[PDB]
Ligand binder design. Structure first.
Ligand SMILES: NC(=O)C1=CN([C@@H]2O[C@H](COP(=O)(O)OP(=O)(O)OC[C@H]3O[C@@H](n4cnc5c(N)ncnc54)[C@H](OP(=O)(O)O)[C@@H]3O)[C@@H](O)[C@H]2O)C=CC1
Ligand SMILES: CCc1nc(N)nc(N)c1-c1ccccc1
Length: 215
């Protein structure tokens, strides 16, 4: 069965256009994907975007007590054949990239993917897992609404490669910036755009919110 559907595994990210270079066999000035800029020097390519930060927080925070049961029954069902909050999953780099005055992300169950970190090290309240396999084990015995994959690059890749992504909330940052991290490529035929928001202006830079769903 589609584990992404059974455990509501979604992906949420923001990407901007990549700024050119001058020398490197990697500069993709004609990439078929205009918005693929994910990070730069362990940080977001652009500056604190309040409009997107608000969005990300509303989407990853929102829970609907009502619709839970139907989810609960779905999982209880799948399991035999073998406070409400969403889960947020992030790679170690992304986790370390987040300023302390934000970790752990509030109103959300925090999970970090790592092979090095340990409980003695990390003092914040977050589950540490060593593989997507262990992520499924955790989800299997955890009570949550939706599960959001929030980065970085390596975590997106693995999940899209295993077809563990049911939906992708993609913010398009209409601006070019230097980037050393890009959104991993995936077969776009298995998805279709289901939501295309109106345009927004954050201090002059525009941005929109697209939502893809698995076919
Ligand atoms: N624009 C956006 O929406 C987002 C941008 N970013 C940006 O992306 C960049 C970070 O991305 P990237 O460098 O790819 O890093 P990631 O955040 O994916 O973290 C990489 C690390 O996560 C761990 N990890 C990845 N896969 C697994 C796995 N299967 N099992 C266990 N651990 C795993 C490893 O930790 P370990 O080495 O300890 O084993 C690994 O080295 C930053 O610049 C950040 O700011 C991040 C999220 C979103
Ligand atoms: C607010 C920036 C942001 N916007 C969107 N649309 N998606 C994301 N995944 C993030 C993000 C990036 C790194 C760490 C935590 C969240």
């Amino acid at each position: 069965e589609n584990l992404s559907d059974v455990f509501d595994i979604y992906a949420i990210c923001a990407c901007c256009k990549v700024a050119p270079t001058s020398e490197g066999t990697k500069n993709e000035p004609f990439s078929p994907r205009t918005f693929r800029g994910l990070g730069n020097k362990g940080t977001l390519p652009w500056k604190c975007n309040s409009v997107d930060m608000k969005y990300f927080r509303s989407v990853t925070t929102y829970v609907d007590e009502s619709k839970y049961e139907k989810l609960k029954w779905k999982r209880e069902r799948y399991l035999r054949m073998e406070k409400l909050q969403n889960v947020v999953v992030m790679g170690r780099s992304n986790w370390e990239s987040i300023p302390k005055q934000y970790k752990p992300l509030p109103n959300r169950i925090n999970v970090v993917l790592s092979k090095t970190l340990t409980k003695e090290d990390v003092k914040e309240k977050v589950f540490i897992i060593d593989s997507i396999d262990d992520l499924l084990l955790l989800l299997k015995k955890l009570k949550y609404y939706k599960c959001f994959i929030i980065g970085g690059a390596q975590v997106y890749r693995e999940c899209l490669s295993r077809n563990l992504i049911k939906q992708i909330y993609f913010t398009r940052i209409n601006g070019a910036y230097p980037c050393d991290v890009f959104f991993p490529e995936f077969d776009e035929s298995e998805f279709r755009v289901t939501s295309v928001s109106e345009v927004y202006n954050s201090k002059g830079t525009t941005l929109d919110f697209l939502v893809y769903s698995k076919v």
